[PDB]
Every structure is written in structure tokens, then in C-alpha cells.
Design a protein around this ligand. Sequence first.
Ligand SMILES: C/C=C/C(=O)SCCNC(=O)CCNC(=O)[C@H](O)C(C)(C)COP(=O)(O)OP(=O)(O)OC[C@H]1O[C@@H](n2cnc3c(N)ncnc32)[C@H](OP(=O)(O)O)[C@@H]1O
Length: 352
Amino acid sequence: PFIPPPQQTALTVNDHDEVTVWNAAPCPMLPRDQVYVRVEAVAINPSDTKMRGQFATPWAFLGTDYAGTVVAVGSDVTHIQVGDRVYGAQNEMCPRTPDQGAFSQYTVTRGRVWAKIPKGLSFEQAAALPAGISTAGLAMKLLGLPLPSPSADQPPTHSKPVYVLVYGGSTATATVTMQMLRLSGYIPIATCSPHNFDLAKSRGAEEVFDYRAPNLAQTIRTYTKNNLRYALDCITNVESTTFCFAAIGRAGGHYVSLNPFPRKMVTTDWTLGPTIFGEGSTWPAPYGRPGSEEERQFGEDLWRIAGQLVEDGRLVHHPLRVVQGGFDHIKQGMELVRKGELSGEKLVVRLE
Ligand SMILES: C/C=C/C(=O)SCCNC(=O)CCNC(=O)[C@H](O)C(C)(C)COP(=O)(O)OP(=O)(O)OC[C@H]1O[C@@H](n2cnc3c(N)ncnc32)[C@H](OP(=O)(O)O)[C@@H]1O
């Protein structure tokens, strides 16, 4: 049986709320239904930068998005060989599993929220995808929109065009969501900054608008025949919620946000990330919820679908900004992300 290394490097937060390169971190045990991954590349997400204060578990590993090489295979796992390449998501800073996080030299795969990297994709391209895939699926689920068929030789047809507003169409989440929406037969319309217009259109937006434009909500209401029933808010602040409520049609609509938030006929939801694992959250406030087998199966189904889409080139990664380096480079990348210094790109670290 496989024996994990006695120590490794991982990124964590210490007992003084500081992001820390930890050079004596433990290695996880190998679950019988998972595989053991030597991490080759990771992506940085805003969620990583927010794991602080009450949100941090000291000495628990940071990071969601990883891609690496399989070094050991759990005894109950089929269809994966030692030396295969995989990509997937981890559930960062879960006090029950503090030795599992993407920002580590060695991790294990989690649930079935992972896949084999297609032959034509690099570690960096693959690492850019997992939180995107996962978030896009949770949002479509919450909006009440069906997932794409991995078959189906092309999108369902609708009665009339069914628009979906995506506020923040240059975000990492939006560029993956808009491809998926299109594959399901929906027509995304996006708002973002002018320099990311071409990116939004390349990723499935039928039209794209500058979110700063005066009375843009009237423009959108006109465009959608005053019957916009779906708004996906990828920005999630006071202004984006106001805009989305204004753009939704006179007969009502559904607003889904990627974070919690503090007129009639609008239902509202927001995506809780660990939900993709069928895990819940131990956090208090609006976060804590029990896990569920239905949530687990959804996540597996999504990943089976999206895996095939990525494999056939029908779902593509957000543009990359690739850094070569070690764990301090992940730490610096987080700060860049936290400061909003990235536009239209995802920061990926290839671990050297
Ligand atoms: C395995 C994990 C699975 C999950 O489901 S995680 C669940 C989803 N939720 C969260 O992770 C919560 C924590 N995350 C956040 O709060 C993120 O910031 C969200 C999820 C809201 C967005 O992250 P994402 O990675 O999708 O976007 P990004 O960082 O790539 O987007 C940045 C872009 O956001 C845009 N932006 C930034 N501030 C903006 C503003 N005030 N107004 C309008 N747009 C704004 C601005 O775009 P341009 O205007 O075109 O340059 C900027 O480039």
C-alpha cells in the first residue's frame, strides 16, 4: 500500500491571520475511492483571498483549483491509472479535512468533482477550469435551467429567444457559464467593460453592454421585450443587485448571485460553493447547511457532462495569466487578485 510523504509545502493561514507558506505541512491519507495527486498547476480564485478572519481555519490548506499527476490510485477506483493527469476542485479550509486544499504539493481528488485532463490541454489550461465549471453548474441549477447534453449535436430550440442576463460577463465564472447557457439553447446578454467586449462575445454573449452606460436597464428591458426572467449576477454588490432587479421583466424573474446579499415578483438565490461536493458548510450566518446525497449526485453529473464538453472543445478555459514559481508566487498572486488587479484573465501558477 501507498505511503504518503511525511511532509510537504502547502499554503495556509497561521494563528495570526496571515497567509503563510508552510514547509512542514502534512500529506493527506489516500481514500479508497479517490486518487493521489502530485499538484502541477493551480488557479487563484477570489474565494481564496477571502479565507481570513472568521472565514479562516488556521493550518487548514487554501485553494480550490488544481491539476496534477496521479501518483497512487484508491483500491475502489476504476478507469484511472498511475501516471494519468487529472484536474478538479478542492473544498478549501474545511476543518474536518484540513489536509485537503489545492495549494499543496500533494492532494487527493474529492467526491467526483474531477476529471482526466484531455490529451490536448496543459496543466495550466486545466487548472483554470474547476471552480468555473462548478460555479456555472450551481448557477444554472439555481436559475432552473437544464444542463447541456454532452451528446447532442446541437442546442435545444425554443419557442422564442430565452434571454439570460449575465452581470459581469468578463468574470471567470461568466465566460464558462455563457458557453454552457448557449449549449442549453439560451441566449446570454452580458455587461462588462468595453475592453472585454470581444472576450464576452467569443464566450457566448449575443450582445454585450458597458455596465456604466446611463439607463442601461431600460436598454436591456427593451431588448428583452420586457420579459427577462433570468439574471445571473457575477459581481454581487449593491449596484449589481439594483441593476438586475431593474432589468428583469414586468411579469417577474429569477435573480441568482454568487454571494449572499443584504419590487415584487422576483425570486432570489445564491450559490454556496461546497454544495458541489454534497458537502455543506460549518460557517454560521447564511452559510451553514447540512450536506446531501442529491447535492453530491448533481456535482457528479455536472462533472461527467462538463468533462466531456471540455474533452470535445465545446467548453474552454478563461484566458490565462501563467506564472512559473513556488508557493510564495501563489501567495503574491492572491494579493493581486484581492486588489482587483486582474481583468479578463485568470491567474494560474505552474509549480516549478
Ligand atoms: C469549487 C468552488 C465552487 C464554487 O461554487 S465557489 C461559489 C461561488 N462563490 C464564491 O466563490 C464567493 C467568493 N467569490 C467572489 O466573491 C468572486 O469575486 C465572484 C464569485 C463574485 C466572482 O469571481 P470570478 O472569479 O468569477 O470573477 P473574476 O475575479 O474573474 O472577475 C473580475 C472582473 O469583475 C469585473 N468587476 C469588478 N468589480 C466590478 C464592479 N464593481 N462592477 C462591475 N464589474 C466589476 C471586472 O471586469 P471588467 O469590468 O470587464 O474589467 C473584473 O475584471
